[PDB]
Amino acid sequence: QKFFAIKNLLLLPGSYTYEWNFRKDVNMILQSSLGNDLRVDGASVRFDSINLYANFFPMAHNTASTLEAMLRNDTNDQSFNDYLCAANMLYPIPSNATSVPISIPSRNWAAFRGWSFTRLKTKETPSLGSGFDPYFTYSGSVPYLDGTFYLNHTFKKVSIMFDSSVSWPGNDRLLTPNEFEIKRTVDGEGYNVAQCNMTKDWFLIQMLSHYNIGYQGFYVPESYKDRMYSFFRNFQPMSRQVV
Amino acid sequence: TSVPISIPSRNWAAFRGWSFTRLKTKETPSLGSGFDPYFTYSGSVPYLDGTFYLNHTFKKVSIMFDSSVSWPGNDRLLTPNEFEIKRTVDGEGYNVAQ
Amino acid sequence: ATPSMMPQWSYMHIAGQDASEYLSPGLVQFARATDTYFSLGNKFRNPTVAPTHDVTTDRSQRLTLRFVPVDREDTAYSYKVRFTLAVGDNRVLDMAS
Amino acid sequence: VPSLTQKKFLCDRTMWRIPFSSNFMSMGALTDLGQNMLYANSAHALDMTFEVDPMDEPTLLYVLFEVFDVVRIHQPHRGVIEAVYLRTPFSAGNATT
Amino acid sequence: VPSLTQKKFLCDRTMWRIPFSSNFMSMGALTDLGQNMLYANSAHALDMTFEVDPMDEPTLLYVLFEVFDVVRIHQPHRGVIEAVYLRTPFSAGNAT
Amino acid sequence: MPQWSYMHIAGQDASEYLSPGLVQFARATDTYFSLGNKFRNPTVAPTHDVTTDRSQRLTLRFVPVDREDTAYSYKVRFTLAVGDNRVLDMAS
Amino acid sequence: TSVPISIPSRNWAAFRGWSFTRLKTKETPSLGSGFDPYFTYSGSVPYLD
Amino acid sequence: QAAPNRPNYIGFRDNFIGLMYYNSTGNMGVLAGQASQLNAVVDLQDRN
Amino acid sequence: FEVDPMDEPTLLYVLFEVFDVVRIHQPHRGVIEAVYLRTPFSAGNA
């Protein structure tokens, strides 16, 4: 059970109805190494039986009843949260385009925390707002909801601005006081960090919110705070020479 | 022949007043980087030179607050909803000088 | 900003007291004395608040009314248009225009 | 022969992050600047744009707003479950529903 | 032959409707949710994503944001008609 | 703030809004029936004094005041100007 | 096949509900000058009928 | 081999719709005291 | 806006004239303070 409010909810006595819907669409449930369409060339998944399975803890009822009446309290209430804990906003880019602006009409940001984004190839992102999608022919990994991301380096740079003109790097902080720079391609200022073609403000905004390092020397972060989907684990510069 | 623009909600408090013009893209810098490599032109940039010369091409503007109201407001005008700057369909009679 | 904003304004003399006033009375005399040499005039902004109430209407009055002839004859030697001015109420024309 | 250089920064399986904190630090799940008075009393719209290397294959953006998704689940009586969903900056329901 | 049933619902001369009530009913005029937009002086931004069946002729969607259009005419003293137009839900006029 | 202390979005912590009996119980049986992942501790951040508004560059750029060249060495003469009310831990 | 729209911030104190239809551009008079040198339809006009 | 032409029915609008000038500020109407000119018809462009 | 069709990329110009006052208040021997404001179109965070 992957849903956050149900993932690890602690239930109490009483009978509970519990129904769920399973995708029978072959293409959107099986992975293929070539991303070839599966339901066309041939494929099928026929379901046979679906059974719920649970493992109670054989707590002695003497204490189980206390735990019952104890979690029944108002102040004793449980609480959960989704891990990624953030909205999702797809934004279609023109087939081949240079930039893309977005806009959010006036809205409270009481507990906003930060933006996170990436790029996707629309051929491989399923619009799961319907029980079926006849147009999802791609079969391979889906970066939308499969952890995969492989284009989040094609961004040249990003800009933010509050309601018309309030840019939010801020009262100037970044080396480029208004433009989050990620792929600045020509330097007379030498703003590109590693021997790569990053910017020394982006590689102070990354590896400073992920590994919380910076302001005190960029040291390789320990693996217990560098996870598999972390920034440094996957950063990769390179270079050659061309005639 | 149309440029619908918009601005999210504001505290249009002192908003004194708009002021338009129209600049050819070939001659207007990219002043956010320095050495905009795409300014293949010397001329006279009518963006920080005050040499605006394209206002002879404008035909109509339409201010509308909250997507409903209209700022040349209650009728005060002759075309009470669309600022007319160039009437090429002359008729009722407006068309000032000669 | 505030629902009044008046204070947040006056702290730039954006619409508030004039310089002759907020300037410490000592400085004003010095600036009014040495004004023919080293003038401290073009740096302490004033204001310009324009009249909020009782200067403009809210309910009528197309700026440029259009009256049409109530008469016309082609004598080949004149054209005697007979308009009908109807300057309304709370409303004045100043027949220049 | 002579030679002119080239460089990329291949970074995959990771999402860019622009935390709302004032100094861009992980100073708390609910950020410093997030609770600031200005953003807690008067909403704001937003305009914000990206670059992209031109890919002839159609592509679509992907943006997240790092919004609290809290939930509280209570069971008053044997067999009854009550839940409260919430999304502080991007609430999923308001006075209009 | 075999057959592939096609279906089509022609419904013309009427305007598509989506009331603003909570339960989509015509209980009153100032719809329930209408008064329910309390919270005092608070606002909202609307978004909308109509689909259509691709036609081959430039079309104009004609969404019809509905609101009261009350106007109170008044004749104080013999010859002056005073009116007050107060459209609500998408207001007009800068004359509070 | 209420509507924020209700979700423990930011408010008293898991060990100090639970009924003390339940803190005791969870501490008693955490070794085999952990309950610490069911109640979320909120975690706010310091909101008052630790970020400045007066416009301070995040990262500074310094150019060589002067230099030399001996065909083997290369001296660079930098002027590290740290503004008042700032600390530049020379690691960074 | 899609046509997104938007309305800036507003309050809907007395909003009653939406309504809509679909019209053909060649039959949709524009009313801002009392003369449309581009209206070329003699047929029925759904907009104001 | 000829045939009849299409049947065309010229005619005024239903309820003479469009003959008058409504919802088109520009050329709007008027209603007021002849010596106290103060309109009784203020039109928006969106009232149909 | 209505714009005559000119056969070349163009660009509008939308000056939202607004108050742009500045206040310089050096209150010590070497401190040049300042407070910028732009009433209808400021871009200040805080």
Binding site: - | - | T2 | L38, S42 | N41, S42, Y85, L86 | - | - | - | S42
Partner: peptide, 24 residues
């Protein structure tokens, strides 16, 4: 023809979508 408005969208406490004074 006071085409009246009546509607002011502000925001509890009453600040209007805004933007504050940038200082050096």
């Amino acid at each position: 023809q006071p085409t009246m408005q009546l509607m002011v969208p502000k925001r509890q406490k009453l600040e209007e979508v805004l933007e504050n004074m940038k200082v050096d």
